[model samples]
Each structure stands twice: as structure tokens, then as C-alpha cells.
Target: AGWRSAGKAPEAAIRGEAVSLQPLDAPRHGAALFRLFAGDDSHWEHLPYGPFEDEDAFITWLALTVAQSDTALYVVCASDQALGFLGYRQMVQAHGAIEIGHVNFSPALRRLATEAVFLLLKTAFELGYRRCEWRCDSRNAASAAAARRFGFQFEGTLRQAMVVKRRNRDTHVFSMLDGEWDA
Candidate 1:
């Protein structure tokens, strides 16, 4: 049989042994997320948006970000407490490809980051995706290291690929294929 397009990223909850991912809901997760992200400029450094001035601002941003059709945002939670979040974006179903980015985790949730990524990768491949991508700011050395540790092979760097927070950004690209999942 020939190849077929993969389905879009799942909107249903994804659970793992250590953490679970639920579709980002402003009303349910906004307050807890704000507490985790606010007062810490470090968490928002490489991200385009960040460290909200107030809870209202965070709620407003979450509302708009979650509403976008192309990106599927998820709140990484445990015992019903919102600890962090990420997104599955740049989904190209025809190519059976998707990108995972927008990852932000609180100090408490940092230890579970690997499990969270594993869960997403498992779901993506199970859903028929042929390729999964990890793209990040080249200056984010931690992110690039994490990508490699997660088994994504670096494709190359896209120089001057973006402007985030009004500054030029170089993007590092990495990918994991269906065959590479369990390897």
C-alpha cells in the first residue's frame, strides 16, 4: 500500500505514568499557570510572549492562543494542578508531519519534561504521523540539547528565520521519524 496523509494532532487528553496533558482551557488552567510563569523572566526569555503583567493579561493571551486552529495547546498537569504547557504546531497532515514547540515548564514540572515529550511523540506516531519536528531558537542551547536527548536528529539551522521580541532569531531544526521512535 502507498502512503496516506496523517490525521491532525489529537485534541483528547494524553496521559503518561508521570504526567498528563489536557487541552489548554483558560477557565480551568489560567490562574495556576500564571502563578507558575509570573515573577520569572527566565521562563519567558526565548519565547515570543511571556511574563504577563497580570493574571488578566495571561488569561487574555491564553484565550487567543488556545483559540488558534493550527496550534493544539496542552496544559501539562498532575493531580488536577496545572504545572506547565506546550503546543503541537505546523501540522502538515499531507506530509504526515508536525512540530512540537511552545514548551514552558515550571520548576516543579521540569523533572517530568521527558515523560511529557515521550507521550506526545507516542501519540503522534500512533496517529500515523511519519515525522515529528523539534524547532527552537538556536540560542537556546538547553532546548537543542533536549531535542537531541529526546532522539531528534538535527537537520540544520535556519539562519535569520525569525524575529522574536523584536530581535533576530536563528532557528535550529530537528526531526524524529516513525522508524526512530523506539530506537
Candidate 2:
């Protein structure tokens, strides 16, 4: 592992209460993942990506971009198809920290659990991180509410923290200390 790499994607699944997490192996999931966004109006308000218009375009992007640092994403899946994906960002092993982002979920996936978030938090601690952070648009009410539900302490907002969707963003940072993982 590099000094600050989020290590590598785990070969074993990150198991949760209902679903299992795995790295998106494009060879196996390449097509099914394409179907995931096909004709779907992906919610991307606070996200940087898209509600891609067609399956072909998304399939190409998956193989070329996501498949190809794209090692940072995790595949959230159930018995039938790929559900959603989340990316690990600002992963600083030296500082024992990371931010979970690019969390795009399907309507059905939302019902399964925010189990993905729970899995990420558990994995971060398992990897020896002292702090796990989540940053979202200050205006994303649902996201902030979920963060609180997961026991993340709101750390306040950063004005002009990022440029998203060609507009300035104020990021609200929420964190859960390692010690909080136990209870």
C-alpha cells in the first residue's frame, strides 16, 4: 500500500444486515450496471455525475472511466442486479481519515438500507481510521438527516467549498469518530 492509499478494494465482500458490498468488477458487472441507469432519472442534485440519457453511453463510461483511480468505487448490489455505487474520496491513511462520496442510489436501493454507509463506516474503522467524514451540499436536506441518523456529528458548513454542477457549493461536513463505532 502507498503511504496514503485507501489500501486496495477488498476481495471479500463488505457484508451488512441485508446487502453485500463489493468492488465493481467491470467484466462481471459491466452490462448489468449499464442497465442500472438505463431510462432512469438518477437523482444527481448534490452529485457531480449524471442521469445519463442512454445505456450505451453509460456502459462506455463505466468501462473507460469508472473501470479504469476508478478503483475507489464500491458496487452496492442485491440478488438480481447492481443497485447503486459510492466512491471513497480524500482518503488519507496517514491522517487516518476518508470521506465517502459519489453515493447514488436507486429508488429500490434506498429501501434496502443506507447499509452502504454503515458498511463504509465499519470498513473505515477496520482499516484503522480515526475519523470518517461525509460532505454534502448544505442544501441537501435528506443527506444531512441521514448523516445524523448514522450518528455522525455535524461539523458545520464550508462556504464555497466546491464547484459542483457549474455552481458554487457550501459543504456541510459531518463526522463520526472511531470511538463512536462501538455503540
Candidate 3:
């Protein structure tokens, strides 16, 4: 049988029992999102950017984020408050493969983060995506563990795969196929 490309994730907000994901809105959420992670330097360590010098700089980053056509970022909220953000990136719809990355979770969000992931994965699989991916710095033990806990199988590692934030990154790749979503 032949298969076609999966559709891109929608721009609408996704609601859950304990959390909801709203499409990233800088003007409405910029300041709150900045304050959400202001004091946490460790939060930006593995990512390519952030731990912004000021609110203005963070807003600038948001503008850059919005300019990216390929990434669909969302603000994860709970109790109607912005907690953190994550997104779908490196989307290859032609092959029905998409990646979940750009994850930044505050201490508050981390506690309820599983629901956010479950929702995103369910959406992607239901949208006819054949595979969903999770890639992180190999040194990021917590992230790798989170992927495993979410039922993503570790495929392998690409050594010295990238240098982000001026640091070497060995990328660990994990994936969940559509068939594995329920079983």
C-alpha cells in the first residue's frame, strides 16, 4: 500500500486535564514567559539559546522564534498560567516523521510535564504521522530518561553531532512509531 505525508500540527490550543498548550503568543505571553524562567541559568544550558540578559532580549528571541516557518512552538500552561514551552521541529511530513524538541520546563512545569508530552504524541500519531522523534544532548541524562519513561525507544547516538551554545553535543535519538502508541 502507498502512504502520503502527514499534516502539520495545528495552530489551535490543545487542552488537557491539568495542562493546556497554546500557540506561542509573544505579546500576550512574552513577559510572563520571561518571568517563568528568569532566575534559572541551568534551564538554558543544553539549549542553543536563552537565559536571556533581560526581558527585551527574551522578546527579541521570541520574534526570532516566530520567524521560523518550520517550528510550531507552544506555551505550556497550568491553572491558566504560563509554565514553560516546547515545540515540534525538524518536521518531515513527506516521510511522516516529526521531532519534539525545544523543551524548556520550569520546576513547576516539570512536575506535570508528562501530560504535555502525552498530548503532543497523541496528536502527532492521530494526525497520521508514522513516527515521532525525541532527540537531546547525549549528556542530558534527565532528558534521555524522560524519553524512555515516555516509551520512546533509544535508537542510537550521533557523536559530536552538533555544537550549540558553544558546547559539543552528542545527540541521542529516540523514536515512537505509530503502531507503538498504544502497545
Candidate 4:
């Protein structure tokens, strides 16, 4: 069985810089996250199921979700300002596979590519995952471009995988397998 422990957590300094991944503990980071998510609904649009009416509800769900899953969530910060959140969930321990999801970046962080991808990729690889998956709504062109830029191979799309706010969504999947990571 999988267990959760801060001691077993993974952390990595952003490549070519000093910023690092800091665990997203709700009690300590909720307010800042609330502010980030509260900024725009467009960023949250394709997300399968949330427009959290309020910050408290968003924070509450985040806290509960993190507590129960075999996952790690980190806040990507630079010069002490929270720029975004990245999360990875260990899916198949036997195969050392994990999925990176719930990634959100504030407007301030957009186009500042190197640092964010470096931070996220480093965290995933350092955690010893043999496969790291990235998925998003097919219509999210920015996200799809980012995934390809990070070297994830386009695997395929899951048709009608989810419905968000009454619209059906086709999820585009991408992955970086262990063999590919070394190349």
C-alpha cells in the first residue's frame, strides 16, 4: 500500500536558478492559492468540473483531495511570490508511473517557460517515476503546445472523456516514458 509522508517527499531546485518546489500544504498556503484561482475563470474553463463559487470551497476541496491521494502538490514560486501550482499523482507504483495534473499558472507566469518546465520535469524525474503523463482538453492549444515543448510524446486522445459546464471534452494525452527521458 502507498503511504503519505512529508519525509518521503521530493523537492528540486528549478534548473539554472535557486527557486524550488515547495509542498502545497493547505493550512499554510490556502490563502495564496485562493487568490490565484480567484483571478480568472477562463483559465479554469476546460477543467472538467469546477468554477468553485468561492475560495473557501476551492481550498476545502484541495485540502481534502491532497490528504487522501498518493499525490504531491507544489507551489512554483520565484522571489517569494507564488506563480503556480503543480501536482503529480503516483498511479501505478509497480511500474513507477505518475500523472502530472492540476497545473495552473497565473498570468504573471505565462511564457516564462524554462523555469516552470524545469521545475516540474525535475520534480517528476527526481521522484523516480518511470513514466510521467500530461493530459489536457484538446481545445487548450496553449497547454498542448507547452506539453510538446517539454518533450512529451503525443499519445492519443480520449474521446468524450469528461463534461464540463455542459460541454463534452476530448482529452489529449501525452507522456514521457523512462526510456524517452534518457534521450
Candidate 5:
């Protein structure tokens, strides 16, 4: 089984509010994305493969990377500007599952409830995923808090799951299973 495009559909719309997930492609959305991740090195440094050292290189790699996967990348737009980006990929398993990763949010979008996490959770559920996974550096308290706030259940930690910024990082895994959603 595979995830069918929710048809480039605008998944959710709250009156006087706007949030949706759109695919990433060229004409490219990196300029705004760069602004989102820039100077956020503390969080970025421990990310997989490390954060981009140069804006141009990051954009180039981002474009190329999104181009080649079952992944879907979307810029989180609010009031018609790219406030942040969220990316996801279907897991290579028979069960309809997926993971949300590589999320970056600018200062403008931070702490705005229902912008980043709500939209992403709605997207995952609406897209027919039975399991939506989120993994981050174990040291990332903010991420863990967000995961819990959105109703994701803690799965387990993967020790030494990644090497980032020259340090070994344990990964904290979280997920919202479909059956758990309506419980």
C-alpha cells in the first residue's frame, strides 16, 4: 500500500485562520526556509547529517533530496508567507505508516498553537496513515513536549541512533497510531 496524494488538497482550514501542507518543488521555496533555520544551530547541529553550513548548499541539497523520495515537503504558510517547512515520508512497510521529520520553524511561527504541529497531525491523519512517527534528539525537550501535547505516545529511545555535530545522539521516538486516535 502507498499514500495517495490527498490530491494537492488543502487539508484543513479554520475560519479567520489558514494552515495547510503543500508540496516542495522548484521555483524553489528555500529562501524562506533558510530564514527559518538560520541561526538555529543548537537544534540543527544535532540533526541527521548535520545542518547546512551554507545557505546555497543547504537549498541545493534540500531541492535534490526532496526530488528523490517518497517524501513530501511542504512549506507552512500563514497569511501567505512561508513561516516554516514540514516534511514526511512513507515508511517502507506494508502497514500504512509514515514519519514526520526535518521540520523547521522560524521565530515568527514558534509557539503559535495549531500552526506547525496541529497542521502536521491533521495532515497525517487525513492522509490515511495508520501510524505517524516523530523522532528527534533525546536532548530536544521542546520537541518531546510538542509530541506529548499533540497526543503522540512515547515509543522508545534508540541509543546511539545518530552521530551529529561529532557527538552520539540517542533518538526519542513517538507515534500516534490510528487506533489510538479515536480512543
Candidate 6:
């Protein structure tokens, strides 16, 4: 009734005290996230994607990535408007692992981020994942700090992990084990 497997996309709805996580159509979600983050290019400070020139520019990108079979995206909602979003990436059934990333929680919803993360983390385990990971630009101290504060163990860094926004990037990795979840 939840995630089918690691190979295919996930189907899950996670609800928490301050907000909920539901499936999102990326092309459409841009508009949802845009209004909140508009004029605030800083919102995309740590991310490789975003701070689009305009809604159309963002939608164009989403239109291409939304239908991608590799990842599952979700919206952080408070009944009406979308407060932010996150994506489940680098999933592997054989490895029983998945990474929850591309998180962009607005200030209005930042307080509820943990519950949203926990909801998905729980769902990942329910789907048979032995590992859950959080990765971000190494320079993103706030993200790294927040992830560790949320109990994810720091596993060092991946140098030249990626190149985004036209520059090289170092990735910081954090993770939690399924065994850790049960304990």
C-alpha cells in the first residue's frame, strides 16, 4: 500500500502535525514554490537547481525532470498552498538505500521540516530500505548542521561530488540505518 520497491517510483503520502507530504507534478509545483520563493534567489543558495529567471524558466526545467522515472517528488503542504518540496533520489532496491534531497522548506514551514523528513524516512524503511541518506553542498553549513542535529550521522565528504550553477561542488553526506530506526 506504500512504496512498491526501490527501482520504481514511490507512492506514499506522509502526514504530520504541522504539515503533510503529497505527490507533486514538478512542472506544476514550480508555480507552487515560485510564489513563495519569488524575488528570493537566496532560497536556492545551496541547491544546484533553482532561483530560476522566472516561473517559465523553472517550469521548463520541471517539465523535463518531473516525469523522470528515477526519483519521486513531494510537496510540503498546509492544506492550501505548497510551503516547499523535497525529492527522494539515488534509490536502490538491491542496496536497500535511498537519499531524501532537494529539500526546500520555506521559513513558514521550516519548523515542521523534521516531521516531514521523519515521515518520509519511516516510509523509506517501510519500503525495505536499510539506509536513508541526506546529502548537500559541503559549503551549506546550515543544512549540514540541521541534518546532524536531526540525528543523521556525518560520514565525511565527497570531493568534486558534482558541478552545479557552473562551479565544482563538494558534497557532505549524512545517513541513518534501518537498524537505527528500529532501535
Q: Model 3 misses residue 34 by how many Å?
A: 1.0
Model 1: weakest 10-residue lDDT segment is 1-10
Ranked by lDDT, the better of candidates 4 and 5 is 4
Stretches of model 4 off by over 4 angstroms after superposition: 1-18, 111-113
TM-scores for every predicted model: 0.92, 0.81, 0.93, 0.85, 0.80, 0.87
Clashing pairs in 3: none
Model 3 misplacement above 4 A? none
TM-score of 3: 0.93
Please list all clashing residue pairs in model 1, or write none if there are none: none
Q: Which stretches of candidate 2 lie over 4 Å from their true place?
A: 1-9, 59-71
lDDT of 6: 0.79
Can you write out model 4's per-residue Cα lDDT over 77-170, one digit (the tens) per residue?
8766777777776655556777887777777776453575666666666666677889999889988998898899999999999887888899
Best by TM-score: 3
**Count of backbone clashes, every candidate in sequence:** 0, 0, 0, 0, 0, 0
List the global CA lDDT of all models. 0.85, 0.74, 0.86, 0.73, 0.69, 0.79
Q: Candidate 6 on 67-161: residue-level lDDT in tens?
A: 66556788888675788888788777767788888688887877677777777887787777878899989888888987887678999899998
Quote the lDDT for 48 in model 5.
Answer: 70
lDDT for 143 (candidate 3): 93
Worst 10 residues of 6 by lDDT: 1-10
* Alpha-carbon lDDT of model 2: 0.74
Q: What ranges in model 6 sit over 4 Å off?
A: 1-12
Ranking 4 against 6 by TM-score, winner: 6
Report the lDDT tens digits of candidate 3 across residue range 17-112: 888999897777888889988888888887878789999999889878766766778889876688888888877788888888888888877746
Q: Put down candidate 5 lDDT per residue, 1-183, tens digits, no spaces.
A: 345533232324422245655566534777667766777766465467536677787788787767754566677775657777767766433456778777776666764435656666665666566788988899888889888988889999999887877788999999999777767
Per-residue CA lDDT of model 2 for 15-115, tens digit only, reads 77777888766557756666666675547667666666666666666566554342366788766367887757677666777777778776678745577
